[PDB]
Homo-oligomer: 123 residues x 4
């Protein structure tokens, strides 16, 4: 993958959360996520995908991943997806927007989904 080495490793967002990811040659993303906020403790599995052959015109690298907020410690009955792009270079970043859906009754489904934005850096 063009940015396999750029993406693989440890990232931190503006909340102080930790994203540990391995990028595969094929486009796979596998790792763990630890949230600094919310009803979450320790690491959660993540999986996702990235564009392993991005444009060479200075565009970012599209990618996304999911965490279901169940691990051996806690189950928040919810899942977050991040959708964004990796930008390489001196100050490498992953710029994302996210959707956090909680399981709800049908009556409460209108209030099931939070939306936000996270920026991940290497420091």
């Amino acid at each position: 993958g063009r940015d396999q080495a750029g993406i693989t490793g440890t990232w931190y967002n503006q909340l102080g959360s930790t994203f540990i990811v391995t990028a595969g040659a094929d486009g796979a993303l596998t790792g763990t996520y630890e949230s600094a906020v919310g009803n979450a403790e320790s690491r959660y599995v993540l999986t996702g995908r990235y564009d392993s052959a991005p444009a060479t015109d200075g565009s970012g690298t599209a990618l996304g991943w999911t965490v279901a907020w169940k691990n051996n410690y806690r189950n928040a009955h919810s899942a977050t997806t991040w959708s964004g792009q990796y930008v390489g270079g001196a100050e490498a970043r992953i710029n994302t927007q996210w959707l956090l859906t909680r399981g709800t009754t049908e009556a409460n489904a209108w209030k099931s989904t939070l939306v936000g934005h996270d920026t991940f850096t290497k420091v």
Copy 2:
């Protein structure tokens, strides 16, 4: 997983797209996605996560998945994430919202991300 058998199989959305997924006991989602719309042809790999131990109070099952829009046919330099819940029973559904990020230059990043909603059924 509580809804491992409920989620596993073939789903169709309101656009006529086809989502083929296998749910693992652990919370894994793996499969293929074929979009009826957009700069897409044939099947794309997907991966995601679901809550393998949902609430028993009639709430849905939180889940999410990602497609990077690169396969052997086409590369749209973009990724979609769906975030939603599975609702079991006579008319089983997966109700989602999605974020579609395209790789962009920094100047164009304000117009990188589409948002929408898809409802998947078994027929």
Copy 3:
């Protein structure tokens, strides 16, 4: 406005909420909103804007509006914006996506904003 008469009047969404709007020649939207769900009672003021000279190529009419959830009865310390398009004809509709922001502390701002979708019809 091209759709001034089409938009003006009473609309109902899938939750059973009631949207009463007047469209001005200039692009203004003014009216009241009554939510069937949530910490809301009676009517709330709304204001917004629409495209008073839409494309003639069968495209919808872009529009948006805001409700702050304060009236003489209740104050939820929150605001919803709907962004969407009006589609005229036998089954006229306003198809929207919405963002509902609650006032929060800085620590809680990551969970300030819900996202959803509403479809309004004339019946």
Copy 4:
């Protein structure tokens, strides 16, 4: 309004856009928006709403507004809504997420809506 004087005036976002707003005692927002980016020239009318009696517990002030991208110069057949909160004090800010809907045919409605985030400051 509690933050009538705090909100009223000129704001700038991270793109270099200019938001000029007057907050009314009642909860009204009226002003003009000038985008630094996109198919936009000069000022566009905006209208919105804010919570005129926010919580006194250090929470932000919920607010929203709409611009339809039609003025005497250009018509992009689209509308943006910003949903967010005002945070007062030394470094006052309005933190928003936005939805930008373009008028589309029914076939293209899946790609009608962009989502992003803008932060406005007084300098």
